[PDB]
């Protein structure tokens, strides 16, 4: 009743092999990355146009700079505020 090495290996492998499979999450994430890169959809004919509109890329690239200017512009990134007058030096 102490879970020697073999039992915990069994449990760990069961839990791990439960994941690492073709699930909807990985497919959706890979598709998001593909759409960002502007990769072909897969329905393009040999002799016709195959251009792709860029929307996810534009939205991400328009959102990111604000999210960096906030949280980065000040040089400092965090400030610890004391609770009482006896913590100031620690703060």
């Amino acid at each position: 009743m102490d879970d020697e090495q073999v039992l915990r290996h069994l449990d760990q492998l069961v839990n791990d092999a439960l994941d690492f499979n073709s699930s909807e999450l990985s497919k959706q994430r890979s598709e998001a990355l593909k759409y960002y890169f502007g990769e072909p959809f897969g329905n393009e004919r040999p002799g016709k146009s195959a251009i792709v509109s860029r929307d996810v890329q534009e939205t991400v690239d328009w959102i990111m700079p604000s999210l960096m200017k906030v949280f980065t512009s000040g040089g400092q990134v965090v400030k610890y505020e004391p609770q009482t007058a006896e913590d100031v030096e620690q703060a």
Binding site: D55, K69, F71, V78
Partner: protein, 151 residues
């Protein structure tokens, strides 16, 4: 030669507008002010502009601040006080403060403000001006040594 009707172009424009409405950010959207998350911000901008549809971006900046980065820096502080390293802090600052890590789970000493350490320098700078004016007034009032000291 045959030509396509205007429905295609019109509804291309409609789809662009729909994307702008869904995401909340468009081609003419102003960027976020670098003091959006500040307390004592004043600066009623971002409220004057930035209609409710695009204030969505604000929410993201808020959601990141109160959930993830705050936890990150709380973890950093906890690791700093649990696995203490003397002679690194001393080399950095020239002085040391002893902290007992017994009650680290309580978080009863410091408040984390990932609230951006942006432009507050002018605020406490004017505050120092007014405080020094008060000090001059007190000294002129005959309170030296009882109200204020040279230190």
């Amino acid at each position: 030669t045959p030509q396509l009707s205007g429905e295609v172009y019109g509804m291309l424009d409609r789809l662009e507008a729909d994307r702008g409405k869904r995401t909340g950010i468009t081609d003419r959207t102003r960027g976020l002010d670098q003091n959006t998350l500040h307390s004592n911000q004043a600066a009623m901008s971002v409220n004057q502009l930035m209609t409710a549809a695009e204030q969505q971006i604000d929410l993201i900046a808020r959601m990141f601040a109160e959930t993830g980065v705050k936890r990150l820096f709380q973890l950093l502080h906890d690791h700093a006080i649990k696995y203490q390293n003397q002679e690194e802090v001393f080399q950095l600052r020239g002085k040391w403060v002893a902290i007992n890590p017994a009650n680290w789970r309580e978080r009863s000493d410091l408040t984390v403000t990932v609230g951006i350490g942006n432009m507050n320098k002018d605020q406490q700078m004017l505050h120092l001006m007014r405080i020094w004016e008060m000090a001059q007034a007190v000294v002129g009032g005959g309170g030296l040594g009882v109200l204020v000291s040279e230190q």
